Design an enzyme around this catalytic site. Structure first.
Site, PDB file in Angstrom:
ATOM      1  N   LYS A  34       0.831  -1.193   0.000  1.00  0.00           N
ATOM      2  CA  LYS A  34       0.000   0.000   0.000  1.00  0.00           C
ATOM      3  C   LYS A  34       0.881   1.265   0.000  1.00  0.00           C
ATOM      4  O   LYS A  34       2.114   1.180   0.114  1.00  0.00           O
ATOM      5  CB  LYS A  34      -0.926  -0.036   1.213  1.00  0.00           C
ATOM      6  N   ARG A  94      -1.654  -9.513   6.873  1.00  0.00           N
ATOM      7  CA  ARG A  94      -2.236  -9.775   5.561  1.00  0.00           C
ATOM      8  C   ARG A  94      -1.198  -9.314   4.515  1.00  0.00           C
ATOM      9  O   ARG A  94      -0.915  -8.113   4.387  1.00  0.00           O
ATOM     10  CB  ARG A  94      -3.535  -8.981   5.450  1.00  0.00           C
TER      11      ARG A  94
END
Ligand SMILES: [K+]
Ligand SMILES: [K+]
Lengths: 264, 251
Positions: free
Chosen positions: A202, A238
């Site tokens: 991200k 994750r």
């Protein structure tokens, strides 16, 4: 007691590289088998995103994307999580035997989500999202919201140890707000609900690099957040690179346990 | 403030391949190149025949050079060439003259815990006592207190249990305020972190785990084989610790 490694299985049509050539159940099965081999404890299947400017799909459509993939892998010796914020999608998947519902809205979109997850004796991940124009300190807002939602989850009958909290890195947060959140993971861990950290590739990890990178080149700084997060007490991560994180987490878990054991 | 990455350059049985590897290590983010000619008994001359040609070739590079040697004749020859650090596996115990040589060139020295395998006292206490005693010896030779590094010596004269005790208590070594160099890379300790008889390269991720863990405990440098992995991971941990400080107004 190990930190759980949650692999990512994105099944949204557009996330597919080769014109969607490999957007089918058989490809997803090959991917899941690879992730299991690399050490994944959980496979997070998702067909929708709550990011602003994204595709808005129907429940039937989401089900079209997720159901066939869930059915094909739910029999594997790995836990299955589904990224969905709609209880109708959640219930269909739970009937197929999924283990976790990863709700990007923390039940704020659909409050039935709580009784649905509880009805199937499953786990739920409550992710911090929305209210980007908040006027109070992000970590306070996040704690207030996530704790109210977790309380709602417990009311529905979901055990505290089956209610995960996810800071929502990458959603409705300025670079300032994410810096604050990453500096205070200990406070989120202090709530005593297991914490899931999801920063993989991200913007936050993109900006930990000194140059523009392709997503894959952000794997090492992602692993850094993994190690750091485990050191702070997060219970799962994750990630896209399952193997790097699985092996790194094995190391950090070993070192922390060795340390606790030796200090009684 | 950044954790320094010390890349390992084992030159035990040519310069071209050594230089190539050093080139790669600098690219991958290495702050120091540690040249080692004694795998650890070859003569001093034989050690110099291995180490010297390499040092002559890479010392002019924009990177610090450390030489893994415990004999002052090898150290001196290298220091004359301009190396920056002497990484001593014996913490000056093998050759008392090591400190005078280092003082002479105003270089840094890493004192590694080693020996006394049949120690009386618990390993951490024995390590601290031996290393601080040697640090004292280094200072009275004229080496500045801020140019002395301590290395727990993972892989040397310690049982499996003792190394686990050392790794569970790195803060007590970091507390001495001497900069600490953690050197676990691909050693038995990392192999056993993996839980089976892995190949050396397969231990790179658990080694990166000791790196991140070590940085969180305050070690100041990591000696590694996989420079790129550890450089990027260390950079990330450094950023997270500094960010944590920034948002809390710590330090
Ligand atoms: K399963
Ligand atoms: K140099």
């Amino acid at each position: 007691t190990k930190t759980k490694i949650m692999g990512i299985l994105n099944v949204t049509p557009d996330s597919f590289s080769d014109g969607g050539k490999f957007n089918n159940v058989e490809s997803a099965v090959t991917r899941v088998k690879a992730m299991m081999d690399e050490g994944a404890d959980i496979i997070d299947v998702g067909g929708v995103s709550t990011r602003p400017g994204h595709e808005m799909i129907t429940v039937e459509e989401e089900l079209n994307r997720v159901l066939p993939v869930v059915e094909a892998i739910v029999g594997f010796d790995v836990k299955i999580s589904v990224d969905t914020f709609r209880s109708e999608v959640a219930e269909a998947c739970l009937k197929l035997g999924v283990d976790i519902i990863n709700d990007q809205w923390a039940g704020l979109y659909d409050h039935r989500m709580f009784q649905v997850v509880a009805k199937y004796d499953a786990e739920i991940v409550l992710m911090h999202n929305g209210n980007g124009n908040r006027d109070e300190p992000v970590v306070e807002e996040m704690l207030t919201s996530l704790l109210a939602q977790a309380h709602q989850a417990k009311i529905a009958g979901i055990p505290s140890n089956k209610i995960w909290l996810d800071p929502g890195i990458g959603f409705a947060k300025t670079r300032n707000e994410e810096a604050e959140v990453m500096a205070r993971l200990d406070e989120l861990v202090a709530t005593e609900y297991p914490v899931l950290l999801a920063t993989s590739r991200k913007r936050f990890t993109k900006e930990m690099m000194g140059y523009d990178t392709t997503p894959v080149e952000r794997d090492e700084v992602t692993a850094a957040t993994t190690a750091y997060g485990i050191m702070k007490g997060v219970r799962a991560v994750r990630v896209h690179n399952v193997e790097l994180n699985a092996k790194l987490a094995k190391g950090i878990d070993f070192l922390k346990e060795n340390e606790n054991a030796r200090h009684n």
